[PDB]
Design a protein around this ligand. Structure first.
Ligand SMILES: CCCC[C@H](N)C(=O)O
Ligand SMILES: CCCC[C@H](N)C(=O)O
Ligand SMILES: CCCC[C@H](N)C(=O)O
Ligand SMILES: CCCC[C@H](N)C(=O)O
Lengths: 383, 386, 388, 386
């Protein structure tokens, strides 16, 4: 597990002891409750798990809200890829972010210096302050100044959603100093980026996108140090946003095919963005590749943003004229997905010739570049 | 039409399935849902994000906004409980968390909680993790403990693990303008319905009884449209969703609920009576002179499937009792297919001496679907081992 | 063990789970199973290919040889049926197919099958797809129809869809040296146990009652070690395996079987009595009802009337077709033992394109009583009958 | 689904109408029985499905043994990749082969001209004659002579198991003439080999290997013309070796990642066999891309992900090599996510002595999705331990 390449680590990660048990894949244990050997041993295991610690070997899991073996394997698998001490799995990416914010509030640090742009849900949860949080939206150059004596977390996302703007993680961690940094590494995945290497304390992942890879398993996981993992596990035990054994099995199963899926989707996206650049209907294409963020932080990407000349009307027509490419709000699936991010806020437009709002997000799937190029070209021509 | 609860448990939430050509609800694992139009999809997104239910003929947009499998399970329980709508979460604690978070954001962070309460619910209010201020009051101190900042009144009947009953008619009258949340996990919609008494929210830990087999984790609140909208808004941003597989098993479990509860309660009623005639046990706690205010018949149409045993030996006798059981499995849960046993005093105390404290002798027992002779013979053998 | 059937249904097949620290059996989807040693793995392969059960502490080798989830469900039903072992297949027809294939390879392709039999079982013997020769004999013609080439005697009680009872004590006595296969799908191990009467094989379509919710497809035969070995050999090469998910749901369904059967039978016993007092129906077919127990089989063979009812309508096929299409709560589908009440017209499977005719015969309607209230089921069926 | 490249066809194949229904993945319908609209329409659908025909749109599936929608989507998906008229899915690869043999017997053609080498199970099923079949084991050049007026099928497998010897499919179909040809395309998959293009009538696939791709879903499917697909569907309706909805969903899901998995596994295998050739312990390496007949390019667009190893030590060295692997798992299967190793000679021979016999030095290896450096370092360590 230490001398293995990431491709080998994705397949055998979290599969510890399975070869020895006589099985090929991890068993799906749906057990809500777990019987105990001795009242004394079961009571100790209850206190140990309720305090946020990891289940010691040879001890009963006690209850699924305290510990689930299926979830546990998926947690260790991602922690190995991200090179973090431990990982904590939740029902969704928003449930992991919710627990990270709730832990900061209870530790006496309700203030968060978030750096925009951020994912819609993360941006709205901080803005609402539903979990008793204070937010200070600062730019990349205003991080060190926006830090208060009450700050508990610095939430950053690279590449940004949906603009795909890169943020230098080496500068963020240096500006935060004593404050831990949470990096939403959903778009990059552990294949292309590892925020732990740059200095981030927490690495948020929406397992729904890329980690699952098929658009069927909902999930969220944070790869962080033992201290933060304990806080996150304490919140999970009382708030109960658990990952179902079936979801945990499909997310762990999806990690095995992650290296090959990302390598293929990134190759297709690199050619697709270059081919789409040679089009009169698109003014500019947004694809990673000025500070030399590539190589130092990211080893490409499978997402492309397209700014159209027609604005909202051309973007709306482009989304509805796609047949092979599916119009839905998600990413990292098996098929190519398309979405209009401006349409989520500007909805009852009623077909007006808007000058702006012409950005279209696109999540490259596992299809041939010729078929995706021909489909999107057909949709662009329909105007 | 006017359906009996037994029929309503089987066909509830199964609307349109006969017409679609299927026997059981399909398990749609889809994380994202494609949209017909950009304009129609955007409206469905705003409608679902604002906490409203998915209108027919509209895309679910995303699983965090709406899941069809979860939706069927929600309507099935709401019919069983006679509440306007229901909201399903990953666990019973996730439903309680969303109920507390909604109260805080509505400007009512204060909660007047009536003890005894379930371990997790009690610890969540004491910690104040969600920005809540608790005021632990007795049944007769409810109206006095209500502050101008109170948003919810959390009560639980029968209590855990003492099985003490609380008069829901008195609680709702004392709360007045403040909504009442009743944790009806032990009772289920078969024996008790807090909506008919005046409660605004009805919390259920679907893990116990609703699942009925000890394999599906869940939590659901049957409440009025206004409170369901607030709960749905919290679920959309906090994301403590119920997995399609979990939602299918919890809904499937509702069909066999009437027959399971009527059999487990019958076994429990005889088991508690047979355990009373034992030298080791000083007193048995089973609702069915246990009834003080005539709550059975008026609030509960049965004694339930839970029994609490007061042992004479104290902690040591309770510890050996749950360790000598072979057929009865020692675990921390209830409402499963098999009979479960637990020592509630052991979760806080781990002594190395002969202790006889009030509560140390209490043993919780969740009656399963086994024969009363086999359960009596196993527990009688474990008691003799001392 | 000294356990009552109700306790045995819940804890049966759950051996070692309490000790492992789990509440329910794990769902192991593993197609292949790694081996500890080449020598130990090779022995486990030969042992499982020869039709023997997996010895404890040995690799399952491959799913076609052994599946732990299926294994738990097999032992759970073998305990309820009091048979030595049990073999689980994809469907009830896959279990019957393996039973017929084993008989052919043992040099006994002849089967003395007594009618009436289930549609699929009857059609498989008539077609002779597996190289079998059938001899359809009545209950009193069993001993005479037995040839020196007979390998199995297939009987079904109650019959489908007439619900006619067959005396299993007379069948086993007439078969003598020939093993008897009894389809105990309609009765389940709760009300009937063919092993107690002398049957060698007990066929069950786990889809009906054993699953109990209409979601898991299955088939299992509770039989002696010799027939279980023959059956296990056919399953290893023909590969009609039970998927781990299906095996888990069928095993899970056994826990709630005692309470489901007692409730459905109670509802059926009252439903048939209330339906008898109706002008549209001429005769009701229910084992518990008076007139449907000729040899005193209630108590000796069946400890209940079951949850199936057959209705003889005065209008014939058209009254039966109108009755099926006028049901709203009761679902019209071809199956039994589900959570909800199902209705079907058995004559419609063969006499399908009857367009607005007034045929005198074929007025039988099969009904599988579910877990609903007797008042709601009576009110729905009484409304469908009035629609004529 | 016509002008698409195989990589695109693997992702969107069998996903017809899902985008229109508002879902991202096919729903898992576990329904054993299917309700009907009319008695007359339901009876016609029963006869249509029992006679081996595919379900017409807008008709009830009637029963799972007659039709399953989940299985149906997987059959559509594979048949598109194989360019065959229809496909029939069964519980296992052996269940598909069993139905193919049973259909031939009932059509009055119990004779099968099989060409050695064949897969263990397929070879043992023909030798036993359990389904009333008479086999005639003939070489590639003795096909036309071994054909009797009673022959119904010609079963061939390329590459052979475990030798990986290639068979010219153009010569087999020409020698069979009027007799349909069944090709076991398990190892090759529709990515590298297409038997329909060469003239084969039936294409057998063990969906357990490669089609699933993770070692969790058991399956078997035959891509064949409408006539043979009807005869196979008739056998499936009465013999009932059905594919469970969960298995069918995972096998269909696995088709989406098939192109990327086989391109990566084949690349790793092509380098691994070349690196293993430069080793003192191995006398010869068996890998298609290391070709005298010119079958690569004409029949196979790649060397595959399977490698056979001929060791100098015989049985002793092969057994030691299998037990000295730590990263590579010793199990009897192929096409999984991880690299698997097996000793084929050990299944029949369980000896005390060293036993240097022909085939005892052969080791089968199924290349997974790992790095070539990690697999070379592990196998080189296991060889040094021997
Ligand atoms: C919070 C709205 C849901 C948006 C969706 N998760 C996306 O990928 O755009
Ligand atoms: C993890 C809390 C333990 C209490 C447990 N949930 C029960 O119902 O007994
Ligand atoms: C073989 C015809 C199908 C009959 C159906 N399985 C039933 O039990 O009603
Ligand atoms: C154990 C002999 C069967 C061979 C095995 N199914 C494989 O594919 O290697």
């Amino acid at each position: 597990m230490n001398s293995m390449h990431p491709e080998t680590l994705m397949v055998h990660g979290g599969m510890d002891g399975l070869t020895e048990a006589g099985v090929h894949v991890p068993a799906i244990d749906l057990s809500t409750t777990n019987p105990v050997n001795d009242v004394a041993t079961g009571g100790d295991s209850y206190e140990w798990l309720a305090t946020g610690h990891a289940l010691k070997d040879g001890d009963s899991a006690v209850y699924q809200r305290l510990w689930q073996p299926g979830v546990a394997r998926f947690e260790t698998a991602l922690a190995e890829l991200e090179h973090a001490d431990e990982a904590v799995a939740f029902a969704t990416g928003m449930a992991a972010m919710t627990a990270a914010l709730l832990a900061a509030v209870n530790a006496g640090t309700p203030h968060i210096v978030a750096v925009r742009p951020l994912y819609g849900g993360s941006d709205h949860l901080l803005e609402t302050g539903l979990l008793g949080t204070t937010v200070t939206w600062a730019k990349e150059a205003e991080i060190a100044s926006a830090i208060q004596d009450d700050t508990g977390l610095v939430i950053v996302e690279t590449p940004a959603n949906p603009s795909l703007d890169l943020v230098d993680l080496d500068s963020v961690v240096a500006a935060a100093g004593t404050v831990p940094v949470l990096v939403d590494n959903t778009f990059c995945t552990p294949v292309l980026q590892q925020p732990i290497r740059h200095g981030a304390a927490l690495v948020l992942h929406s397992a729904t996108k890329y980690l699952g890879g098929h658009g069927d398993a909902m999930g969220g996981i944070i790869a962080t140090n033992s201290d933060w993992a304990m806080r996150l596990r304490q919140v999970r035990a009382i708030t109960g946003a658990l990952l179902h054994p079936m979801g945990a099995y499909l997310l762990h199963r999806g990690l095995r095919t992650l290296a090959v899926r990302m390598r293929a989707a990134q190759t297709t996206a690199g050619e697709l963005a270059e081919r789409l650049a040679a089009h009169p209907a698109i003014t500019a294409v947004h694809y990673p590749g000025p500070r030399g963020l590539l190589g130092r932080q990211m080893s490409g990407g499978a997402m492309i943003a397209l700014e159209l000349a027609g604005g909202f009307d051309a973007a709306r027509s482009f989304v509805e004229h796609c047949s092979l490419v599916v119009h839905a709000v998600s990413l990292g699936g098996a098929d190519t997905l398309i979405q209009h991010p401006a349409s989520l806020t500007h909805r009852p437009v009623a077909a007006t010739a808007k000058p702006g709002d012409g950005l279209i997000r696109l999540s490259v799937g596992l299809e041939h570049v010729d078929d995706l190029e021909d489909d999107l070209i057909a949709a662009l021509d329909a105007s």
